Design an enzyme around this catalytic site. Structure first.
Site, short mmCIF file in Angstrom:
data_model
loop_
_atom_site.label_atom_id
_atom_site.label_comp_id
_atom_site.label_asym_id
_atom_site.label_seq_id
_atom_site.Cartn_x
_atom_site.Cartn_y
_atom_site.Cartn_z
N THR A 159 0.76 -1.21 0.20
CA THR A 159 -0.10 -0.07 -0.11
C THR A 159 0.90 1.29 0.01
O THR A 159 0.42 2.23 -0.34
CB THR A 159 -0.89 0.02 1.31
OG1 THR A 159 -0.39 -0.55 2.24
CG2 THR A 159 -2.26 -0.86 0.79
N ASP A 181 7.08 -7.82 -28.80
CA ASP A 181 8.35 -7.02 -28.74
C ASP A 181 9.60 -7.36 -29.47
O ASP A 181 9.05 -7.73 -30.84
CB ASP A 181 8.76 -6.91 -27.39
CG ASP A 181 9.34 -5.57 -27.02
OD1 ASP A 181 9.12 -4.98 -26.06
OD2 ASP A 181 10.55 -5.20 -27.65
N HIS A 189 15.15 -5.25 -25.43
CA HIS A 189 13.91 -4.51 -24.88
C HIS A 189 12.74 -5.72 -24.55
O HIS A 189 12.53 -5.85 -23.45
CB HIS A 189 13.50 -3.58 -25.89
CG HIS A 189 12.37 -2.66 -25.21
ND1 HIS A 189 12.92 -1.51 -24.74
CD2 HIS A 189 11.23 -2.60 -25.19
CE1 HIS A 189 11.96 -0.89 -24.01
NE2 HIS A 189 10.88 -1.42 -24.65
N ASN A 233 5.95 7.41 -24.10
CA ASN A 233 7.00 8.14 -23.25
C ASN A 233 7.02 9.43 -23.97
O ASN A 233 8.10 9.78 -24.16
CB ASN A 233 8.36 7.40 -23.52
CG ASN A 233 8.12 5.91 -22.81
OD1 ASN A 233 7.59 5.48 -22.18
ND2 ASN A 233 8.81 4.81 -23.68
N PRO A 291 -9.61 2.18 -26.58
CA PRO A 291 -10.09 2.03 -25.50
C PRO A 291 -10.56 0.74 -24.67
O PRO A 291 -10.22 0.57 -23.47
CB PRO A 291 -11.69 2.71 -25.52
CG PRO A 291 -11.61 3.40 -26.97
CD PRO A 291 -10.53 2.80 -27.69
N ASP A 347 -5.82 3.37 -18.13
CA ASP A 347 -6.43 2.67 -17.20
C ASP A 347 -5.93 2.37 -15.88
O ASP A 347 -6.55 2.02 -14.86
CB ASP A 347 -6.92 1.27 -17.77
CG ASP A 347 -7.51 1.53 -19.11
OD1 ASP A 347 -8.79 1.55 -19.10
OD2 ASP A 347 -6.79 1.27 -20.22
N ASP A 364 -2.45 7.71 -4.71
CA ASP A 364 -0.95 7.64 -4.22
C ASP A 364 0.05 8.34 -5.13
O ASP A 364 1.03 8.77 -4.74
CB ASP A 364 -0.54 6.41 -3.92
CG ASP A 364 -1.24 5.67 -2.66
OD1 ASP A 364 -1.61 4.65 -2.84
OD2 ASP A 364 -1.39 6.22 -1.51
CA LIG Z 1 -8.98 0.91 -21.59
#
Ligand SMILES: [Ca+2]
Length: 278
Positions: free
Chosen positions: A16, A39, A69, A161, A175, A200, A260
């Site tokens: 947490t 990748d 990578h 990035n 989405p 998300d 957080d």
């Molecule tokens: Ca989504």
């Protein structure tokens, strides 16, 4: 289970609070689940994979990861030392060349492959796809990532990035998948991490220690590093039967650490991936 002196990102998704060093997780560790790492490939012979990694497809001259990578992101998914789901099965789909770059048509074909190749694999606890790649917007790439998601695969994609809104980047802007932003070890949004309403979940993405080519390890930063955390967490949660591939992204947001992170722009979720293990 408890991993002492774990990579900060592994300890983060089991706590947490930030600053801890122990990765707590259920000993099931994602066994029975499969994660397709689309990748640069995976160095399957790396001792950290313990034979749980295989190359299943390549769109170039060799299936070998000449960049490192993909081996790094696959290590964050399910390496012994650096992986979230330490007993998952890893499948490498090399869609990026050894320069880390790849044409969109190849990336779409790689996602179409995983949607079909999964049904000739034994993954009784579900299938996950981790995709630490992306460029500008493209409805064809978004449609492909949506197809992979609708086929029954938990698709986790990188937000990008560019320190900008992920609305202009694919497959980040699709989405129906799980768009993943990056956070650092002090619970700040990673300096580079994309944001926006399409995100998300946030994962550890700054200075992430994982495996590298040549039997090696190294620490790199990017939303490319936060994606395998979420992909590994999903496979970890699907092995525990707590969710399905169609709902793993919603489950991870339901049970994430809320509020957080810092420097989260208004309109962007303040959710950090968390396994809620006790
Ligand atoms: Ca989504």
């Amino acid at each position: 289970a408890a991993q002492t002196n774990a990579p900060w990102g592994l300890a983060r998704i089991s706590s947490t609070s930030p600053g801890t060093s122990t990765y707590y997780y259920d000993e099931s560790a994602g066994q029975g689940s499969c994660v397709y790492v689309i990748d640069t490939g995976i160095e399957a012979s790396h001792p950290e994979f313990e034979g749980r990694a295989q190359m299943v497809k390549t769109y170039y001259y060799s299936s070998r990861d000449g960049n490192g990578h993909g081996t790094h992101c696959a290590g964050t998914v399910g390496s012994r030392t650096y992986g979230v789901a330490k007993k998952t099965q890893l499948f490498g789909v090399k869609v990026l060349d050894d320069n880390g770059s790849g044409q969109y048509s190849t990336i779409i074909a790689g996602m179409d492959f995983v949607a079909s190749d999964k049904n000739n694999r034994n993954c009784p606890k579900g299938v996950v796809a981790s995709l630490s790649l992306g460029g500008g917007y493209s409805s064809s790439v978004n449609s492909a990532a949506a197809r992979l998601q609708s086929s029954g695969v938990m698709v986790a994609v990188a937000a990008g990035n560019n320190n900008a809104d992920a609305r202009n980047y694919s497959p980040a802007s699709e989405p129906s998948v799980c768009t993943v932003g990056a956070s650092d070890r002090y619970d700040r949004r990673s300096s580079f991490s994309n944001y926006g309403s399409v995100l998300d979940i946030f994962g550890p993405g700054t200075d992430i220690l994982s495996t590298w080519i040549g039997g090696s390890t190294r620490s790199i930063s990017g939303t490319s590093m936060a994606t395998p955390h979420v992909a590994g967490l999903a496979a970890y949660l699907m092995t525990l039967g707590k969710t399905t591939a169609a709902s793993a992204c919603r489950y991870i947001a339901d049970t994430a650490n809320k509020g957080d992170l810092s420097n989260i722009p208004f309109g962007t979720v303040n959710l950090l991936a968390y396994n809620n293990y006790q």
